[PDB]
Ligand binder design. Structure first.
Ligand code: CTP
Ligand code: MG
Length: 212
């Protein structure tokens, strides 16, 4: 039915784009489909959903969901800062570009000089800090998303378990796939439609909120 009737949810989705100039930019391959799916499931279950979307070209805005379109990592951060205080749940599913062009050309660049890169702020960490400082009373649950690959140093779960504690979020969605909770619970995420996966994620949020 409607688990999320009283829940104000803030969802980010898609990838950000950091401009070199008006024409070109630095981006990633994020579709934002998973975040959109989570947005729809939440709204279907009675949540008041605000969705902040990055590069989602062919996706259609979900009905019953307040849409806030942004372009870059900075624009995303400012959007979150604006809408977070009213949110009970923050679903950080956007693929934020780690690096940004240090200087942006006013006009399209016409061998060229190298591009200087500067690190972007950790928007999630900003939210986690704000709640820790008592500046987010309404916030009850914070969800992070991560893509992990096995390397010589460790397993996928090995890296996933580490990132969950580093980010300081309550739940981490890892892509098969995993749902990692801060209490120490681990649930497998079987390959399926983005809809079914969204249901699993929202179920974890619901289950978490009951414990809150
Ligand atoms: N600048 C950033 C980068 C990440 N994220 C959020 O943090 C979570 C972790 O994403 P990930 O890129 O895997 O974490 P990183 O800190 O960037 O780790 P890594 O350097 O391995 O990519 C994601 O939900 C993402 O939305 C964020 O808010 N701000
Ligand atoms: Mg990153």
């Amino acid at each position: 039915h409607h688990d999320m009737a009283g829940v104000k949810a803030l969802v980010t989705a898609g990838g950000t784009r950091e401009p070199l100039d008006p024409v070109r930019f630095i981006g990633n391959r994020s579709s934002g489909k998973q975040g959109y799916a989570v947005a729809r499931v939440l709204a279907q279950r009675g949540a008041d959903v605000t969705l902040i979307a990055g590069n989602t070209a062919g996706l259609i805005d979900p009905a019953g969901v307040e849409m806030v379109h942004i372009g870059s990592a900075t624009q995303l951060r400012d959007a979150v800062s604006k809408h977070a205080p009213d949110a009970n749940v923050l679903v950080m599913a956007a693929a934020v570009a780690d690096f940004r062009p240090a200087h942006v050309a006013a006009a399209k660049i016409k061998e060229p000089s190298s591009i200087d890169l500067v690190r972007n702020d950790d928007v999630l960490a900003g939210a986690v800090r704000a709640r820790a400082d008592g500046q987010l009373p309404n916030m009850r649950a914070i969800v992070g998303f991560a893509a992990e690959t096995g390397d010589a140093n460790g397993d996928v779960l090995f890296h996933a378990r580490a990132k969950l504690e580093r980010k300081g979020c309550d739940l981490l969605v890892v892509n098969d796939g995993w749902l990692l909770s801060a209490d120490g619970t681990e649930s497998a995420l079987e390959h399926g439609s983005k809809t079914l996966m969204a249901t699993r994620i929202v179920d974890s949020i619901a289950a978490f909120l009951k414990s809150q």
